[PDB]
Structures are given as structure tokens and as C-alpha cells.
């Protein structure tokens, strides 16, 4: 019941899991992050990434959409995709990495 | 904020077996399979601790944990294997993150059901060969009955 | 013009970029993967992950959808999300990691 | 398969300046800004190499590369600065991946346009202060004109 080291695209996606799971396991439901863990990362971890550490709500609602505070199996994903995209085209249509 | 405050301690280290009559036996700290006990102190001994908010249905809700460690069975999504979570010390005030390990227990005489407070259509079903999961119930035995062991 | 080491959720999403970019930079358009790089990974890198190394087409079409054979800025993402999900709940409703 | 086969070598190491009259100057190996040359051997020297498939429009298409290395300007999307890609050695047979660095050149007397073969609505626009990008054109000067330097 343990994903041992993986192939390369797996290396990239597994890596996404482990960090995620470290927080998902913190509070209730070790398989999903709550509104507090989202807010913690968005506020603390995301100021650099998601320059919208205030109204986490909007994004939360889009992910939460089933009125499920638990950012579970690819409900969270929308943000995760917004994440990998944001790092790239944040405002990089001129310059953002340096 | 609004806290869900612990109501009362029911019974503890007692084991529930379903209409298939299978002791909820400990296979792992995340996976559990139902099988009639033969070592007796072999099944996971649960204890019920009720919490209170006016968001049940018509029945009061308790948390199922192993009397020694705080291993709760949580409700994932439909026919998805129960995830046994382990977190030091039982919470006295329940937030909205632990809404999966909450259980609406409807007792009928001797038999009893375990309804998920997270997703209504979920009920804890019992399999003959597979792990004791949760489900929407077609011919899976989502019945339970509490049978204690001798010692 | 260079993303130097990042914060933690960034560490996880940046990591997704770098691997990706290594292939995206291989052929035409260093910001997108072609149908041949998709096929290479799906065939070579994905047999373990995406147990459908044959008809890459279906997934390709879903990503390609604009008849843009360039797996670019979060057109690819759909698969990327399917990726991070698949590693977790492949058929993992009984067992898949061991 | 179907190959797009190189048609003919046009002119090389010649620089294009737009109606703003700004030499396409090399700021980086990924970002380029238009500014009137002052070191002359300062702007990126491009060379045109035509390829042929019957998927142009009404005009024959060439690839713009720096005469020394193979740095092509690729057509991204809307108003997003062109990414200068570097790949050792020029391809002789073009597949469906380099459709961004392909250019439908419509020449009118002295002036000329550069249409994206990837996305039709894209045209290579010129900014007074920013990088020479591609665009849909409202008052951006998506005009060009080929002016050579002396030496």
C-alpha cells in the first residue's frame, strides 16, 4: 500500500501527491484538505503563486462546488491546474520569473 | 464559531457484526475486512462518542474509534474503501474537516444501521470477501448488529 | 527569465514544468509537446500510469481539441489532472499501490 | 507520411523594420524588443527558408531563423511575446509541431505582412516600448518593411 519511487511523469505527479497528502493527513480526512489547509496554503504558501491570498473563497467555491469542504480526488484539481498554469503564464506574457 | 459539543459516552471496546455475521477484523491501519473472529481480541474494538449539532437527520451522531488509538472509519464516496484515520487524542469540539468520520446511527431493536452524515446516500455495507466499505445499498448487507466477545 | 527555486506548492508544480519542458523543448515549439512526444511518453513513460499506451488518440483528441497538436498551456492539463488522479485512484478502490 | 518539403532559399541575414521603423534587436534568446539599431550587428539576422504544403492560403511560406543558429520566432496566441526557440540544424521535412515558426508572407509593393500559419488571426505586431509580438491588430502597427543595414 505504498507507492515506491516511480517513472518520470510519475515522478512529477507523485511529487504533487506527497506534498498534498502531508496537509491532507493533518486535519480530518487524511485523503482531503479542509478550508483551513486551503486557506493556510493560499495565505502562506500561495502569496507568490496565487496573488489572491485574500478571497480564497471564489476558488474554494469552484473546487468545493459539491458543498464538500474536502478538496478531494480531482475536485481540488481545478486549482492544481490553475497552479501549474499560473506558475507559467502568471503574467509571464512579458516577464515574471527572474 | 459554532462548535459541535460532545454529548455522551456510550459503550466501548464492543464489536459490531453484520447480518452476514462477520466481526470487523483488523487487517491494517487503513484496510479492514469482515471475518468471524477466532482470536477474539482480533477485531478492532470501537467506542462511540456522540457529538451534537442540529445537522443530523432525526438521530444523534457518534464517532467510531478504536478504544486504544484514535482510528476512525471515514466516509469516502459511495462504494469506496473506508479509510482508517489516526490522530492523537479525541477532539472535544468538531469542526467541518472531520465530517467524514461522523455517523448517524439508526438502531432497530437488536440490529442497527450506520448512516454517513457527510453524504446521505452512503451506508456502511458488509461484504463476504471484501473490505467493510460504505455504499449505496443494492443486495450488499448494509445491516449491522452489535455482538460483544467474551474476553 | 528564470524561475529560481520556489516555495513548497510551487516546488510541487514547478517540478511538473521542468520535466514537461524538457520534452516540449525537444521538437518544434519549446512551450508545447507534439503528437510524437505524447505518444513517446504514453507508450514509454505511461504503460505503468496510463494503461492505454495504444490508442493515445482518444486522449490526444480531448487535449488537442482545437486541432492544435501542441499540448500547450493547460490544454494538456486535462491529461495532467487525469495523471495526478490516476496515480492515486487508478482502480484504487480495492488496491493498486503495493 | 506527408512531408512539407523545402521550396527555396530566399534572402538571409537581412533585418526587417516595421512602420515604426525599429530594428528587431536581440535582447535575449527568448525575448526580442524592437529598437532602431545603433550597433548594427545588434539586431537578429534572419533568413527565410520556404517549405511547401498546399495548406498555406494564397502565399508561400518560409521559416525565419537567425543565420547562425536556428532561432525561430513561433506564433503563440493573441498578444503574447514570441518565444525564440533554438534547435540544432534546420529541418528539411516539416511535421505538425513547427507550425508556429511558419509564416505566410503577403507582400504589397514595399510593405509586407507576416501572417501566422498556425492561427490565422495572428499577425506580427510592433510595439514602441514592448517586445515584437503577434496580435490581432487594433492600433498596433502590424506593418513591416524590409530595410537592410550597410554592413
Which residues make Cβ contacts (< 8 Å) with residue B96, sequence separation at least 6? Answer: A34, A35, A69
Cα angle for residues A57, A87, A19 (degrees, 5° grid): 70
The whole-angstrom separation of Cα A74 and Cα C81 is: 7
CATH architecture of B1-151: Trefoil (2.80)
**Chain A nearest-CA residue for B85:** A30
Please tell me the number of Cα atoms within 13 Å of B134 on its side-chain side.
25
C-alpha to C-alpha distance for A15 and A30, rounded to whole angstroms: 17
C-alpha span between B120 and B136 (Å, rounded): 9
DSSP state for residue D44 in the 8-state scheme: P
Which residues does D79 contact at the CB level (< 8 Å), separation at least 6?
Answer: A93, D125, D133, D134, D135, D136
CA distance A43 to A60: 13
Domain count within chain C: 1
From chain D, pick out residues whose CB is under 8 angstroms from the CB of C1. 28, 30-31
**Is A36–B97 a contact, with Cβ atoms under 8 angstroms apart?**
yes
Q: Report CA Rg, chain D.
A: 14
Grid cell, residue C20, equals: 514537461
Q: How far is A96 from chain D (nearest CA, A)?
A: 13
Which residues lie below 8 Å from residue A67, measured CB to CB, with a gap of 6+?
Answer: none
Report phi then psi at A42, rounded to 5: -65, -50
How would you class C92 by CB atoms within 10 Å of its CB: exposed for 0-12, middle for 13-18, buried for 19 or more? Answer: middle
In which domain, by residue range, is C44 found? Answer: 1-98
Half-sphere exposure of A5 (CA within 13 A, CB side): 0
Q: Which residues contact C67 (CB under 8 A, 6 or more apart)?
A: none
Where residue B40 falls (left for φ over 0; alpha for ψ -120 to 50; beta otherwise) is left
User: CA torsion, points B48, B52, B58, B62, in degrees to nearest 10?
Assistant: -10
Task: Determine whether B2 is exposed, middle or buried from the number of CB atoms within 10 Å of its CB (0-12, 13-18, 19+).
Answer: exposed
Question: Domain coordinates of chain D in residue numbers?
Answer: 1-151
In this structure, what CATH number is given to the domain that contains residue A60?
1.10.238.10
Best of A85, A91, A93 to substitute, by most chain D Cβ atoms within 10 angstroms, is A93
Put simply, the answer to whether B80 touches C93 (Cβ < 8 Å) is yes
DSSP string, chain B: ---EEEEEEEEEEE-EE-TT--BEEESSSS-EEE---SSSTTBPPEEEEEEE-S-SSSS-EEEEEESSS-EEEEP-SSS---EEEE-SS--SEE-SSS-SSEEEEEEETTEEEEEESSSTT-B--B-SSSB---B--SSSB--EEE-----
Beta-carbon count within 10 A of D93 CB: 11
User: Is the CB of residue D126 less than 8 Å from the CB of residue D72?
Assistant: no
CA C36 to CA C24: how far, in whole Å? 11
- Residues C42 and D140: their CA atoms lie apart, in Å, by 42
> Crossing angle for the helix pair A8-24 and C8-24, nearest 10 degrees?
170
In sign, the C-alpha dihedral spanning A52, A53, A54, A58 is positive
Cα C20 to Cα A38, A88, C76, C80: the distances in Å are: 26, 12, 10, 10
Partner-chain contact A93 D130, CB within 8 Å? no
Of all residues in chain C, the one with the smallest CA distance to D77 is: C73
Angle, helices A77-89/C8-24, rounded to nearest 10 degrees: 70
Beta bridge partners of D49: D9, D63
8 A C-beta contact, residue D52 and residue D60: yes
Q: Which residue has the cell 501527491?
A: A17
Please tell me the distance from the alpha carbon of residue D28 to that of residue D76, in angstroms, as a whole number.
17
Residue B57 forms contact with A (CB below 8 Å): no
Mention every residue, 6+ apart, whose C-beta is less than 8 A from residue B94: B3, B4, B51, B53, B102
Q: Are D24 and D34 in contact (CB under 8 A)?
A: yes
Amino acid at each position: 500500500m505504498a507507492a515506491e519511487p516511480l517513472t518520470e511523469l510519475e515522478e512529477s505527479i507523485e511529487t504533487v501527491v506527497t506534498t498534498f497528502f502531508t496537509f491532507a493527513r493533518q486535519e480530518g480526512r487524511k485523503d482531503s484538505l479542509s478550508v483551513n489547509e486551503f486557506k493556510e496554503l493560499v495565505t502562506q504558501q500561495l502569496p507568490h503563486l496565487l496573488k489572491d491570498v485574500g478571497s480564497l473563497d471564489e476558488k474554494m467555491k469552484s473546487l468545493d462546488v459539491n458543498q464538500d469542504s474536502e478538496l478531494k480526488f480531482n475536485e481540488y484539481w481545478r486549482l492544481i491546474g490553475e497552479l501549474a498554469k499560473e506558475i507559467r503564464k502568471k503574467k509571464d506574457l512579458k516577464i515574471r520569473k527572474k | 464559531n459554532v462548535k459541535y459539543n460532545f454529548m455522551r459516552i456510550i459503550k466501548y471496546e464492543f464489536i459490531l457484526n453484520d447480518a452476514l455475521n462477520q466481526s470487523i477484523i483488523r487487517a491494517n491501519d487503513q484496510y479492514l475486512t469482515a471475518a468471524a473472529l477466532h482470536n477474539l481480541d482480533e477485531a478492532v474494538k470501537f467506542d462511540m462518542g456522540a457529538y451534537k449539532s442540529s445537522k443530523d437527520d432525526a438521530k444523534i451522531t457518534v464517532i467510531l474509534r478504536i478504544s486504544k488509538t484514535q482510528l476512525y472509519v471515514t466516509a469516502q464516496d459511495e462504494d469506496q474503501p473506508v479509510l482508517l484515520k489516526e490522530m492523537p487524542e479525541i477532539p472535544k469540539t468538531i469542526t467541518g474537516s472531520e465530517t467524514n468520520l461522523l455517523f448517524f446511527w439508526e438502531t432497530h431493536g437488536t440490529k442497527n444501521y450506520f448512516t454517513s452524515v457527510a453524504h446521505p446516500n452512503l451506508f456502511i455495507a458488509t461484504k463476504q470477501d471484501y473490505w467493510v466499505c460504505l455504499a449505496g445499498g443494492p443486495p450488499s448487507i448494509t445491516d449491522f448488529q452489535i455482538l460483544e466477545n467474551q474476553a
